[PDB]
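$ run holo --ligand "copper (I) ion" --emit tokens
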Amino acid sequence: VEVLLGGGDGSLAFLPGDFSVASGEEIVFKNNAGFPHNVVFDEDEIPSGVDAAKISMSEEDLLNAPGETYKVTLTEKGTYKFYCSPHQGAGMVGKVTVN
Ligand SMILES: [Cu+]
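-- output --
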């Protein structure tokens, strides 16, 4: 799945905003509109068997042109809220889940 950061430009959101995956699969986070963006897993709601610092981007690393991307192979069976830290309060939140 390629999670599209910038839902049609007219929705400051992902597409999808909720999805599920299997363990060992890869999520591709890519830009669409409204730049810049990033992906950050929420350190209070991720599963216990990981650290968001291995799956979020670095605090000053962001996707600033249209075609830029970030990628992660993900594991551990649980809920996965990742959001985009500039826009998470503005509503840009996604829910992956390894199931
Ligand atoms: Cu964003």
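-- notes --
The chain has one domain: 1-99.
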